[PDB]
Design an enzyme around this catalytic site. Structure first.
Site: not given
Ligand code: 8YJ
Lengths: 223, 4, 205, 4
Positions: A93, A135
């Protein structure tokens, strides 16, 4: 096209180089982050791709922030005299300028700093590749680095829970067919195209990878 | 899909 | 198939913004040598076949308008678009009247914002201190997140010799990589930065 | 050079 000399990174070395793969799938509850379903498939496809290329791939799993910094610092203190280049692949992430560990968040600039020319003399003048998967539609200390982020700053990078990050799938596909005969920028450009075309507040969306190049030469995985 |  | 289609009546427009003198309120000194740099850029990009227009001492508003206006033009018969920015700067922001975010100057040419430029390369060269919306952009920054000789800048001098000799025979990334090298070597440091969202190989031919 |  051609293969003009003087302009190509010297590949006449004993080994292609190290390839660290950090595969973060499970995160601590306090982070609010979820299981990255599909990431195991991403790591297997890549390990297989970069081994095929000639890399010594090592795959780490569910790393902390201290682990991620330490392993990269340690990797930077090894002797790379015998390696043509170096590569590191982060699957996790992320948020602007930072990547998640299982315990929290650490800036990518701190992770890549370990390999700056004045801090990693045995990789000086050699390519330092970094691939980061994290992301609406219609000599200088920073030379020889190259980053291929899965999306551009501020948008979200998608990942099929059972097929893997599009970026990864696409990259692996391109490397299998052309990894030993195309220059790195042509490969990453073809990956930009693959991602762009082949893939209700989260419906009917798209994404484009970003390539930041500091390379001083063309990089070819052969000869 | 899931994003990160 | 793997190159940007260049079969158009015009290569494209090229906006050159040349900021040399700043208002005493900004506190930036006169940038000596930038007129040599620009003149060169003008001859090179003209040689490449761009319709070049040089704007001097723009303001935050003038720049935002120049680019919004350019994005509102009709690029159907153009292969691409180029914009070169010479000025003072800080992280993520460019500097006669103040400071404007690079995101604002580029957004105008985003997909929807400029349907007539979709699938065409948009090149931005910055020298200072369904299908996707942000795809097909390319930024060549003079340093990473820059030195100038009262002879011109290293980045621009390099960029111009390469374009003079190989602009018609090398791909954009090859050219920019060669520019990265020269700069690094001559550096007697700073290394330019190339950010690419291109989806094809770019040849000016 | 100068600076910038
Ligand atoms: O991708 C980076 C790393 S910067 C860098 C660029 C080229 C060479 C070395 C570094 C290095 O210092 O390791 C980044 C992260 C956050 C921000 Cl704000 C700006 C850049």
């Amino acid at each position: 096209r051609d293969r003009v000399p003087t302009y190509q990174y010297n590949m006449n070395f004993e080994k292609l180089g190290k390839c660290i793969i950090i595969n973060n799938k499970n995160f601590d509850k306090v982070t609010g982050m979820g299981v990255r379903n599909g990431t195991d498939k991403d790591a297997e496809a890549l390990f297989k791709c970069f081994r095929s290329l000639g890399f010594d791939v090592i795959v780490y799993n569910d790393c902390s922030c201290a682990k991620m910094q330490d392993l990269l610092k340690k990797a930077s203190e090894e002797d790379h005299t015998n390696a043509a280049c170096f590569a590191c692949i982060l699957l996790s992430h992320g948020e602007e300028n930072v990547i998640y560990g299982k315990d929290g968040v650490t800036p990518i600039k701190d992770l890549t700093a370990h390999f700056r020319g004045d801090r990693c003399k045995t990789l000086l003048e050699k390519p330092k590749l970094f691939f980061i998967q994290a992301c609406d539609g219609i000599i200088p200390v920073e030379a020889d680095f190259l980053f291929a982020y899965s999306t551009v700053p501020g948008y979200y990078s998608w990942r099929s829970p059972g097929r893997g990050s599009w970026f990864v799938q696409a990259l692996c596909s391109i490397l299998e067919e052309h990894g030993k005969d195309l220059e790195i920028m042509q490969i990453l450009t073809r990956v930009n195209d693959r991602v762009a075309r082949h893939f209700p507040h989260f419906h009917e969306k798209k994404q484009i990878p970003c390539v930041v190049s500091m390379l001083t030469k063309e990089l070819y995985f052969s000869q | 899909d899931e994003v990160x």
